[PDB]
Amino acid sequence: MYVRTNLTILSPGWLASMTSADGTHAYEMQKSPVLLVSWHGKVMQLKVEG
Amino acid sequence: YGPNAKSMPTEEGIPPSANDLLLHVLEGVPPPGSRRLVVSGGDARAWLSNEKMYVRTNLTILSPGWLASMTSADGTHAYEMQKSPVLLVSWHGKVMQLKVEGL
Amino acid sequence: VPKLPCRVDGACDATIIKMMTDLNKKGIKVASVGQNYLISIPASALFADQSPRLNWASYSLLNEIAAFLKQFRKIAITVTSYSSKYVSVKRERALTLARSRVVSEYLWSQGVDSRIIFTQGLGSDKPITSYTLGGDRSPNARVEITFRRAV
Amino acid sequence: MDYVKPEAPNVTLLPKTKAEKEIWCIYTERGWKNGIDQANTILEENIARIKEDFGGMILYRKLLAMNMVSPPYVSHTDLGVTGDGSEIHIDDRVLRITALPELNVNSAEWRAAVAK
Amino acid sequence: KETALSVGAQAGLAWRAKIIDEQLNKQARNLDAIYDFNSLVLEHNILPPVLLEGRNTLNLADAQSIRISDRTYKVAKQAHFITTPPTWRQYLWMDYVKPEAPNVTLLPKTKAEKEIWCIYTERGWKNGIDQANTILEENIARIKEDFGGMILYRKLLAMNMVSPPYVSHTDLGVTGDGSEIHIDDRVLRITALPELNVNSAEWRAAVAK
Amino acid sequence: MKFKKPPINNPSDDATIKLAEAAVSVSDSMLEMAKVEKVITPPSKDNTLTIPNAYNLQARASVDWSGPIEELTARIAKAAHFRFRVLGKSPSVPVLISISTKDESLAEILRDIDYQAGKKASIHVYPNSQVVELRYAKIY
Amino acid sequence: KFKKPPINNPSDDATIKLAEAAVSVSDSMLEMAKVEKVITPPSKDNTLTIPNAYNLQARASVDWSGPIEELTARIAKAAHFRFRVLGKSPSVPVLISISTKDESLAEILRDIDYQAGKKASIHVYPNSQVVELRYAK
Amino acid sequence: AKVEKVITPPSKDNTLTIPNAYNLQARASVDWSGPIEELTARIAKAAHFRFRVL
Amino acid sequence: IIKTGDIMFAVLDTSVNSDEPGPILATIVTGKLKGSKLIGSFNLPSNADKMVITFNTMSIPGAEKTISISAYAIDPNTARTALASRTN
Amino acid sequence: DGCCSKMGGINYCDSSAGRLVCNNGFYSTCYCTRHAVMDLQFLMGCCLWHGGVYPQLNSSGLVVCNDGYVSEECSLQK
Predict the structure, then answer these.
(1) Chain F partners within 8 Å of E32 (Cβ)
(2) Are H51 and H44 in contact (CB under 8 A)?
(3) Angle, CA of H34, H39 and H42, to the nearest 5°
(4) Could you tell me which of G84, G71, G53 has the C-alpha nearest to residue G115?
(5) Residue C18's beta-bridge partner residues?
(6) Which H or E run contains C63?
(7) φ/ψ (deg, to 5) at C36
(8) Separation between Cα atoms, residue D88 and residue D113, nearest integer Å
């Protein structure tokens, strides 16, 4: 799975994690149905699906 | 990317696994280009190659912090660490200090 | 190398042989098996009649055996206490446990070196001799210390 | 404390007579006292520094008990076997921490306490 | 002084070298008996390669970043052809030469010079002793590593963890001109080097009794 | 009234101590190698079927040979008064067998020889024809 | 009177440990060789039996390095046996090198077939005094 | 540390008990580092047990 | 590379009187340079209480080169600049 | 150096133990090799528990350690 966002990730962990200068991140990892996304110091959960 | 480009992307990856020299340390083979040291305090051997101490023993080091550890199948251990003239170890519940010369 | 100790401090094998000779002259049993050591003391020279009260003169021989035990370098020592069968198994088991506890506490109070002190009381379960005529005068009323000299 | 025995006895001008030898002795005594006090000062500063370290550690522990700081958090991953035909690694796991501890500016998440 | 130190070091090193070579010469048959090589060779006279295994490897790359590997295996020395089995003499035997050149420029004048010359000779003797012991220790460690790599290749080949070597032999009959003739040309090439399998099927388990 | 532990040998050598310390480790690794390989490989056949015992084979020997097999088995055939037989061609690389044993039968010597040879050669016997045959490895 | 001790006896702890470890590694590697060695049953072996007629008992000193058919026909001529082939000879000749000073013709042909291996075979009949070659298919 | 450490009671511990069968009392020297399935099939074959995976 | 002003040792064989000029050779007996030899000459002092040897032409084996280091000599185990001769 | 007294005298040094073995069958107390367990808990030397003494040549009397620590107590002041 490849993801483009501007927030951080906590539980699943990337396999690679690059970012641009302005604050856009591109992460890549193995496919997990659940994501732990961090933003502004707080934590939320995302449910991904096919 | 243009020739006038302000910034380059940030790149990372998997951290490195281990050094290849540590296996020769586990065998007791000194690495090429290194030189032998002096160990005082018990059963331990030491070498210096690239501003890093490499030590083969079977005890457990305490004080100065090490960068890498390798384990045999027989309790023999190899440590890659910073240069330090002194070492702290625990032998059988007793605390011992090791003096290293040649640094 | 002059800062390095050529010998271990406070070691003289001639003194070791001298105090072992004096111990066997006093009659307390001392045995060495390879690198293991077992010392047995009769309780009649140590306690009162079936009671864990210590005679004041026994502390001299306690100092002597502590000075002997200062010599070796070891990690774990074990004390066991044997006695006779008097009223119940419970009574003499408790008495042996208390005697071993008190002598172990005194040995830790003295400056002997170990990491582990194990103490056990067994009473009259393993007689070393079938001659059970006497009571505390019978030689099986005893205390044993065992350890292994490690390098 | 680092200790090296010094071996540098050198005199520029020797004290000639008894009076200057006497003042040489008393100034040696003054230097002895000054070196003693200097070593005590350095030791006291080391004591203060390590007290600072342990106090900061226990202050963080008490603050996390008070729910004033964010706990740290670490992502962990693990893969299968890897490596080339010459070198292989059986289980490869990687732990990178992501959430550093920091204070939380919102006040309502702070639980008080009461002893007895 | 310094010359006494150097000649004492030379004498001690040569003396210890002759002593240890004498001991190695005396203990002959059990040495090469325990260090076999010809029993470990392969079908087509190829030297088996060298393996290494480490366990529980941890690398702190920096702060906030650690990596744990369970078991690591290394191909150290690659397999190749051979003509004769190796022995222990190219791994353990010590060089010997007696330095027979006492070119004395510092002639002993006084007994103080003689005695400090004696004690410098003593510490040079000791330095030669420990130097020879260090060299012998490095030698025996290296040959232990070599034998361990050989037996590790044997074990991981028996455990179906490595690929066997593959060698093709091509056979031709008579060849050459009317002045040179070869009877039966036979050329065999090892096409496939041994390597470690990575799939989940080749793994083989064992249990003792 | 003095004290003494029993074992008092001649004084030792540090390099021999290091040699034995290495050798016990190598022996342990090789021993667990042998155990696990024995576990994963059940045996199939015994070489007693290929070479059985016979009469006038019970003369004994103590030997020390570390060279080619051919002169050794020629000496064996001369002792046994059996006719020598060779099948196949010797390879360019010689077959080297090192043997240090004592007081065993000719049958045991030959069985140890063929076990040490393995896949390079084999030994057959026909006491009915009183012949002893060495067959080389036909390979490539 | 003086039963002398063994001279090169291991009178040291290092020596007895070394020799005992050598004994252990010798026996264990011998067992490794025992479990790895593969043999053949003596009934199913691809070996040429000896018909032991009197015409095959002659001796010769023969060195040869080359093909098979001319040598076998020459052997049949020397032993007064008819010789025939069966199948087809390969384009590459089957080359056999042998060298003997004194040997009998039956085991000479037995080692010839042993050198031949899989690609050819020889059947010898002493009733109708013939030798027959048979190539592979 | 005593108020911090929290552990499981033996009422709901998810640890597999010893089946105490006759044939499962053998001694073995085992080294393995790999997938579980081939190892447990090998153990079942050595102990003469049928083995399946769902 | 040789440090400025160090000390080596040699043995001279070609003896001469302080009367007529002549080349005199010594042979280096230790140190890093081994097998090297050195030809040179002498000087005459006004008073006969000492003597030094002008050593300038040093030859080293191995490579065909001829260095020209100028050096003087000292009496071993006396550490003085005198000469072993008679003055009467 | 007198170690196996009131015994048979010294026989040989167990190098694997780093310890002398007497002619009497016991392990002696004196050490022979430096690869042995001597309980050394005190030693001299400055810039310890650090990068060691920095080997650069400095005009001033201060001596620094390689890890950045300043060894002013090993240094002299005025």
Answers:
(1) 98
(2) yes
(3) 155
(4) G71
(5) none
(6) helix C58-69
(7) -115, 145
(8) 54
User: Would an 8 Å CB–CB cutoff place D114 in contact with chain J?
Assistant: no
Q: What angle do CA E137, E140, E144 make, to 5 degrees?
A: 135
The β-bridge partners of C48 are: C51
**Distance from chain centroid for Cα J55:** 21
* Residue in D closest to E77 by C-alpha: D86
Long-range contacts of I27-31 (CB under 8 A, 24+ apart): I29/E103, I29/E105, I30/E3, I30/E103, I30/E105
F1 touches chain C (CB under 8 A): yes
Q: How many CB pairs under 8 A join E and I?
A: 11
What are the start-end ranges of the E strands in chain F?
Answer: 61-68, 83-87, 96-104, 121-126, 131-136
Scan for tokens 């200790």, then name that residue. Answer: D3
Closest CA to F62 of F109, F98, F113: F109
Which helix H or strand E contains C61, and what residues bound it?
helix C58-69
Using the Cβ of D95 and the Cβ atoms of chain E, whether some distance falls under 8 Å is answered with yes
- Calculate ∠ Cα J74-J77-J78, nearest 5°: 165
CB C28 within 8 A of CB C40: yes
Q: Is G29 helix (H, G, I), strand (E, B) or coil?
A: helix
Torsion of CA C65, C66, C72, C78, to 10 degrees: 80
D77, D79, D81, D87: best mutation site toward chain B, by most B Cβ within 10 Å?
D87
**Scanning the structure block, which residue is given the tokens 């390689």?**
J66
The answer to whether C100 and C68 are in contact (CB under 8 A) is no
CA-CA-CA-CA torsion sign (F78, F82, F83, F87): negative
Query: Is the sign of the CA dihedral J34, J37, J39, J44 positive or negative?
Result: positive
Query: d(Cα D98, Cα D96) in Å, to the nearest integer?
Result: 6
List chain E residues with CB under 8 Å of G92. 171-173
Look up tokens 């099927």; give the residue: E201
Integer Cα distance of C17 and C12 in angstroms: 9
User: What are the chain A neighbours of D94 within 8 Å (beta carbons)?
Assistant: 13
What the block records as the tokens of E126 is 């000791």
Output the six-digit token pair for G137. Answer: 């298919």
Residues in chain F within 8 Å Cβ distance of H29: 32, 35
Residues F30, G28: Cα–Cα separation, whole Å? 8
| First-to-last C-alpha distance (Å) of chain C | 21
User: Quick one: DSSP state of residue D74?
Assistant: E
Which residue is associated with the tokens 């052809």? E81
Contact F118/G37 with Cβ under 8 angstroms?
Answer: yes
Angle of helix F106-117 relative to helix F69-80, nearest 10 degrees, comes to 160
- Asked if the Cβ–Cβ distance from J6 to C17 is below 8 Å, we say yes
- Of the residues F1, F4, F18, F24, the best mutation for testing chain J's interface (the one with the most J CB atoms within 10 Å of its CB) is F4
Query: Is the CB of residue J21 less than 8 Å away from at least one CB of chain D?
Result: no
How many helices and strands, by DSSP H and E, does chain B display? 1, 9
Chains in contact with A via at least 3 Cβ–Cβ pairs below 8 Å:
B, D
Residues of E in contact with F35 (CB under 8 A): 208
Do I and A make contact via 3 or more CB pairs under 8 A? The reply is no
What's the rounded Cα separation, in Å, for the pair F80 and I28?
71
User: With an 8 Å Cβ cutoff, are E60 and B70 in contact?
Assistant: no
C-alpha Rg value of chain D to the nearest Å: 30
Cα(C85)–Cα(A47) distance, rounded to whole angstroms?
A: 76
Write out the E strands in H1-54: none
Residue keyed to tokens 């040598």: G71
Which amino acid is it at C90? K
Please give the single-letter amino acid code of residue F54.
A
Resolution at which this structure was determined, Å = 4.6
Can you tell me the distance from the alpha carbon of E85 to that of E40, in angstroms, rounded to the nearest whole number? 9
In angstroms, what CA-CA distances link C147 with C100, D100, E92, F3, F47?
15, 51, 41, 18, 54
Interface residues from chain E to H (CB-CB < 8 Å): 70-71, 200, 203-209
